[PDB]
């Protein structure tokens, strides 16, 4: 089944713990959001893995360069997975992946914004096995919806051999759009954190995934 | 004008960064809180460095990929002067960061590490972005990628489009003559200053060479 990842896009640890104390056991993957990486630094990764060592912890660093340095900082802090942003030089993805392998972790290419199918082939040739197909939250705020071109692009990525994570303002009602595609992970940030009942929000995601897959 | 000098603080902890700033704060124009220090320490690095050096321009090299308003506000509330947005970001990300920047009388640069297009550059100018960082990837540099003809051509084209151009990416003193005759706004040096036997003298050599090459 597709896994459920909660994005902790909080500015401080104590704000993040407001969410994790409700739903840590309701999800599969705990993401240290970019917001939290910037707010608190890599201590966020170390602290959350110590709290939830049985969960996969993703550091959503969106590394643009200095792949070896930034990945090593995240993996020394006990990250399982780290993200590299799609425009990074191929040697950045390669460097992050080499480090990831030392720690038995993995790298995902986050596909927010502008990238090309040629770059996607490069990531595959470099041994990248995961991508995050990601509607920009700012594009979302400007009225960009999920659409059929996204579905086509997700299937294409899956056919290239990537495990695909889907993200970007996902609500429960969006899940049927992706039906029939072997999605690796759905990310939910706001639709869990900001729900009247975060626990019900998470369980509904899992319920719906179970029905659909 | 002479190109200014920006020191990149790509340290993992504040104390490591202060080992550099206590030597060169007054030898450089812009203090960059490197991406590595943003990740190492969080946005406190911005707040703390601005408090030590309030008279200096402080740049947060956040390389914002999305959530432009949120991330830019965090940096500006920590008293940054400038923030970076990575070239691949959706145009609304750059716009959102700029909107926030104007509230704080700050500014946004687009960092041009990695893959981008000329069409994207026109969108940046149209949205009112006035600064770009022409950036050789440090990982590309480590795989042997040299400064080349195509870099001079693109920098010139960016300048002709109306951007002030910062040059960065493993910059060494001997690289500066490659850029002579182009109105570079800022040169960034990280390792070439931080890792020198004498950071003070390294910074001074950059300033001397700049004053010769652009004088
Ligand atoms: C990033 C940007 C976020 O972590 C990702 O989109 C998940 O959060 P949302 O579900 O968009 O709130
Ligand atoms: O954003 C960066 C990558 C660095 O801060 C930039 O390249 C300057 O550092 P160095 O001169 O060490 O490459
Ligand atoms: Mg995220
Ligand atoms: Mg930098």
Swiss-Prot record, chain A:
Gene3D superfamilies assigned: Aldolase class I
Cofactor comment: Binds 1 Mg(2+) ion per subunit.
Quaternary organization: Homodimer.
Keyword Magnesium in annotation: yes
Keywords annotated in UniProt: Carbohydrate metabolism, Decarboxylase, Lyase, Magnesium, Metal-binding
Residues holding Mg(2+): 31, 60
Family label: Belongs to the HPS/KGPDC family. KGPDC subfamily.
Pathway this chain belongs to: Cofactor degradation; L-ascorbate degradation; D-xylulose 5-phosphate from L-ascorbate: step 2/4
Sequence positions that bind substrate: 9, 190
PANTHER family xref list: 3-KETO-L-GULONATE-6-PHOSPHATE DECARBOXYLASE SGBH-RELATED (PTHR35039:SF3)
Functional description taken from the UniProt entry: Catalyzes the decarboxylation of 3-keto-L-gulonate-6-P into L-xylulose-5-P. Is involved in the anaerobic L-ascorbate utilization.
Name under which the protein is recorded: 3-keto-L-gulonate-6-phosphate decarboxylase UlaD
Sample GO molecular function, one term: 3-dehydro-L-gulonate-6-phosphate decarboxylase activity
Cofactor(s) needed for function: Mg(2+)
Iron is among the record's keywords: no
Annotated site residues (Transition state stabilizer) in this chain: 62, 65
Enzyme Commission numbers on file: 4.1.1.85
Result of changing residue 65 to A: 5% of wild-type activity
Lineage, highest ranks first: Bacteria, Pseudomonadati, Pseudomonadota, Gammaproteobacteria, Enterobacterales
Catalytic activity: 3-dehydro-L-gulonate 6-phosphate + H(+) = L-xylulose 5-phosphate + CO2
Induction: Induced by L-ascorbate. Repressed by UlaR.
More details: The reaction mechanism proceeds via the formation of a Mg(2+) ion-stabilized 1,2-cis-enediolate intermediate. The active site is located at the interface of the component polypeptides.
GO-annotated biological processes: 'de novo' pyrimidine nucleobase biosynthetic process; L-ascorbic acid catabolic process
């Amino acid at each position: 089944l597709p896994m459920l990842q909660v994005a902790l896009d909080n500015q401080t640890m104590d704000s993040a713990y407001e969410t994790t104390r409700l739903i840590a056991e309701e999800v599969d993957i705990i993401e240290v959001g970019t917001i939290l990486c910037v707010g608190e630094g890599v201590r966020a990764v170390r602290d959350l893995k110590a709290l939830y060592p049985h969960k996969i912890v993703l550091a959503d660093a969106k590394i643009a360069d200095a792949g070896k340095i930034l990945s090593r900082m995240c993996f020394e802090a006990n990250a399982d997975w780290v993200t590299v942003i799609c425009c990074a030089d191929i040697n950045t993805a390669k460097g992050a992946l080499d480090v990831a392998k030392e720690f038995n972790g993995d790298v995902q290419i986050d596909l927010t914004g502008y990238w090309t199918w040629e770059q996607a082939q490069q990531w595959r040739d470099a041994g990248i096995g995961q991508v995050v197909y990601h509607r920009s939250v700012d594009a979302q705020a400007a009225g960009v919806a999920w659409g059929e071109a996204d579905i086509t692009a997700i299937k294409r990525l899956s056919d290239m051999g990537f495990k695909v994570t889907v993200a970007g303002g996902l609500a429960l009602e969006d899940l049927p759009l992706f039906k029939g595609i072997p999605i690796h992970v759905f990310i939910a940030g706001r639709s869990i954190r900001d729900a009247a009942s975060p626990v019900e929000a998470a369980r509904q995601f899992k319920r719906s995934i179970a029905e659909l897959w």
